[PDB]
């Protein structure tokens, strides 16, 4: 066909039906297209309506909550291809919650360059089992058709003939009066005409002539003035990779939407700039970037308050915010994960930040890209940040894996009795608020109350590594008053990378990724230590220790807290190779496929595979037919506040009684074939007998040169199929008639084994009479080296002999002619 109509910007048609028919004259609906909220229409106002001009939708086809529609053939049947740089819920054909819909129309839809087909929450939708979504799209994994009435076998379907092309399901038809033309698989990317031939290598989808892109609509090549043109002559830009529109028209569409404004990218007038691009403001060219780069984010009224994980899923695909933000999230389990996912990419906050009434935070790790705060919004009093009502906050983001710089305002930390002043001083300089010579308003009398961050380090005296246990030891530490020592808290976690610290994982209520063990104080000397309870060999773990002491009336700790170290378990024997699967694909070849060891514990140098011949069974020759921690069991289990409170109260009570007593008591003076494969998960056995079993073993060895330490041998049995090349009876069929009219037979057994010959069927025919079949058992065969007939009548007989091996029936021998005499 052709496009003689106009080009119209996308229209969000909702709650009416007047703007819809406006698209009757328009041939190219540039931009989005939303068809939803129509509950005033009825299924009696349509009888089949088609628009000549409209041939293409360019962003997405959306159908949501549409009533009074019986089929998709009442709007327009000329839809050919749905493509563009924009998508609605990542689908090209959205059919969601439609009612009275019982058929799908169109007769030109055969290819979709980009997109998917969603058909969900339907209640009368039928006609989806006659046409397959394999030659109507360019993807075979982007079809989601669920919750319909034709998936439970309740929808009937009838199509012309048992006609509709084909090269309840009968034919390939959309409706009962509209066939679906499946294109021949000789082109595979250019669709086909209603005639049934595939279009040229420049066309796509429906065409009006085969091998004639001039009359083609919706083509891989570009379209201009009425034909598919391979190239776009400048300034003509590649509009959706289907047409050419001069720079002027491109920027005119862009400005008009100011509806998915169209920009210039790779000479294409596409309205979307892929990930990693930025707006070059000379022609608004999407120029590439490294990592995320600035992009405007239209926050509602220049402000977006977040107080829940759901209220934070709107910050994705955003790099430079427009306005300020507020944080009030409380509770929640493993908040840092969703936080870093939803907004980890935010590099700059244009406005201020608020931590008012924040809860369920122990460490801030939500931001890694944040490096600059513009500060266009400031809380009255020249403040660029607020923090308050935080009594679980222990530390901020790490300062050697992150960078932040402020340009205006004063810091503010009030009512944070758990954040020590050290971090505050750190941020005084790093924040870039004390490098401007301006006094900030920060409270130090309401922060750090009954809390501190004063700690020392521990030195591991000895460490013994094993492949299932890691013993640790360290110097005996003691607080100023030995009695204050309450023990140690060995904290450990599995480190896959050498970047595991207390800032990764946890930091939120309901989740913790650092297992904790406890150690009793040392003798008042022996070095305090701990030995693991078993672990995975060849695994790297992050570990550190912390000290527990009796807190004074001010809760000042004198403990020592070692730094995080990384200890990898020792190499052990390789694990068993998972899933040994050998498949006999011929009579002499077998292909094996397996998975590598469950745990390598090194590097697999080579695999060792043995095999031996398994002869044919004997019975066959004799038988003739003629939260993030473990919580399923606790023997050491996580600690709670009550535990610490109680143990400290009891320690203090004991010490009080002891000092009391002492003061009272003291007052001052008055072989087998094998093969080896290196860094390969497949083996091919060459030269094996047909119909012969083979017991194949499979091992793996993490170390081969120092020692031959390997995994257990997994076994498998493979019975090759029997050959089927020589089943026919060989040698001449010797027929010997004697004085008694006994026609003894001397036929030879097939040369090729082909398994085993369970029997020899004979089919003779008396001239002018009915045939006769006879089964010759192996025993009788060997006894006679053929067979033997007793009682032949005068006249000629036709005899056919078909051997029967394990490769199925052979082929009947030709009729031997012997005129039996009397």
């Amino acid at each position: 066909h052709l496009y003689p109509g106009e080009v119209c910007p996308g229209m969000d048609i909702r709650n009416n039906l007047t703007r819809l028919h406006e698209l009757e004259n328009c041939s190219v609906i540039e931009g989005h297209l939303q068809i939803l909220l129509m509950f005033k229409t009825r299924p009696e106002d349509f009888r089949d309506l088609s628009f000549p001009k409209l041939i293409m939708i360019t962003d997405y086809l959306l159908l949501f909550r549409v009533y009074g529609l019986e089929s998709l053939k009442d709007l327009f049947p000329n839809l050919t291809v749905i493509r563009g740089s924009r998508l609605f819920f990542n689908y090209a054909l959205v059919i969601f919650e439609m009612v009275h819909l019982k058929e799908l129309g169109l007769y030109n839809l055969m290819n979709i360059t980009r997109g998917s087909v969603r058909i969900e929450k339907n209640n009368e939708l039928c006609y989806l089992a006659t046409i397959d979504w394999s030659r109507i799209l360019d993807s075979v994994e982007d079809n989601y058709i669920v919750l319909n009435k034709d998936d439970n076998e309740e929808c009937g379907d009838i199509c012309p003939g048992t006609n509709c092309p084909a090269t309840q399901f009968v034919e390939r038809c959309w409706t009962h009066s509209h066939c679906q033309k499946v294109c021949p698989t000789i082109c595979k990317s250019h669709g086909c005409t209603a005639e049934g031939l595939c279009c040229h290598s420049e066309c796509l989808g429906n065409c009006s002539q085969p091998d004639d892109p001039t009359k083609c609509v919706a083509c891989r090549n570009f379209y201009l003035d009425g034909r598919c043109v391979e190239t776009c002559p400048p300034p003509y830009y590649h509009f959706q990779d289907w047409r050419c529109v001069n720079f002027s028209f491109c920027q005119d569409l862009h400005h008009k939407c100011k509806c998915h404004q169209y920009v210039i990218h790779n000479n294409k007038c596409i309205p979307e700039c892929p990930s990693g691009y930025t707006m070059n403001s000379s022609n608004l060219l999407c120029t590439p970037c490294l990592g995320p780069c600035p992009k405007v984010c239209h926050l509602l009224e220049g402000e977006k308050t977040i107080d829940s994980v759901t209220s934070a899923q709107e910050l994705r695909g955003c790099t430079v915010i427009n306005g300020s933000l507020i944080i009030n999230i409380r509770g929640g389990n493993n908040l840092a994960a969703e936080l870093e996912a939803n907004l980890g990419l935010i590099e700059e906050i244009s406005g201020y930040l608020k931590i008012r009434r924040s809860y369920a935070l122990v460490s801030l790790s939500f931001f890694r890209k944040l490096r600059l705060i513009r500060g266009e919004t400031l809380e009255i009093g020249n403040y660029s940040f607020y923090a308050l009502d935080n009594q679980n906050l222990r530390q901020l983001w790490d300062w050697s894996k992150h960078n932040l710089t402020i340009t205006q305002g004063k810091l503010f930390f009030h009512y944070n009795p758990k954040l020590c002043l050290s971090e505050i001083h750190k941020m005084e300089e790093v924040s870039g608020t004390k490098g401007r010579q301006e006094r900030n308003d920060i409270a130090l009398k309401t922060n750090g109350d009954q809390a501190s961050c004063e700690n020392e380090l521990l030195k591991f005296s000895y460490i013994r590594t094993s492949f299932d246990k890691i013993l640790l030891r360290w110097e005996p530490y003691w607080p100023p008053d030995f009695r204050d020592l309450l023990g140690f808290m060995l904290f450990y976690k599995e480190a896959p990378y050498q970047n595991v610290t207390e800032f990764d994982g946890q930091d939120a209520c309901g989740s913790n990724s650092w297992t904790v063990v406890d150690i009793d104080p040392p003798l008042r000397q022996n070095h305090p230590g701990w030995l693991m309870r078993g672990l995975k060999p060849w695994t790297q773990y992050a570990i550190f220790v912390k000290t527990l002491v009796t807190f004074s009336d001010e809760r000042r700790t004198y403990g020592a807290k070692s730094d995080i170290i990384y200890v990898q378990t020792d190499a052990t024997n390789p694990s068993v190779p998972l899933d040994p699967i050998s498949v006999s694909n011929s009579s002499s070849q077998i292909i094996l496929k397996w998975k590598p060891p469950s745990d390598p514990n090194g590097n697999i140098t080579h695999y060792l595979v043995f095999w031996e011949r398994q002869a044919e069974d004997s019975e066959l020759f004799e038988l003739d037919y003629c939260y993030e921690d473990s919580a399923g069991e606790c023997c050491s289990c996580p600690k709670t506040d009550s535990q610490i409170l109680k143990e400290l109260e009891e320690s203090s009570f004991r010490k009080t009684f002891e000092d009391y007593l002492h003061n009272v008591v003291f007052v001052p003076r008055p072989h087998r074939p094998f093969e080896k494969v290196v860094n390969k998960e497949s083996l091919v056995i060459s030269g094996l007998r047909h119909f012969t079993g083979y017991r194949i073993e499979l091992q793996a060895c993490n170390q081969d040169t120092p020692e031959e330490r390997c995994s257990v041998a997994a076994y498998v049995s493979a019975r090759t199929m029997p050959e089927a090349k020589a089943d026919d009876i060989v040698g001449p069929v010797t027929h010997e008639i004697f004085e008694n009219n006994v026609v003894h037979l001397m036929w030879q057994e097939p040369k090729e084994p082909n398994g085993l010959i369970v029997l020899y069927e004979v089919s003779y025919r008396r001239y002018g009479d009915e045939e006769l079949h006879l089964c010759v058992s192996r025993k009788h065969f060997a006894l006679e080296r053929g067979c033997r007939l007793r009682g032949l009548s005068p006249g000629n007989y036709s005899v056919r002999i078909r051997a029967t091996s394990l490769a199925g029936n052979g082929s009947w021998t030709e009729p031997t002619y012997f005129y039996v005499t009397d």
């Binding site: 100023p480 008053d481 000092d659 002492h662 003061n663 008591v665 003291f666 007052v667 001052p668 003076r669």
Partner: peptide, 21 residues
Amino acid sequence: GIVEQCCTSICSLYQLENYCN
């Protein structure tokens, strides 16, 4: 009184001798 005269530092020898007679 043996904890109220020296418990936060080292205890002089005389202090120890005090609690002997």
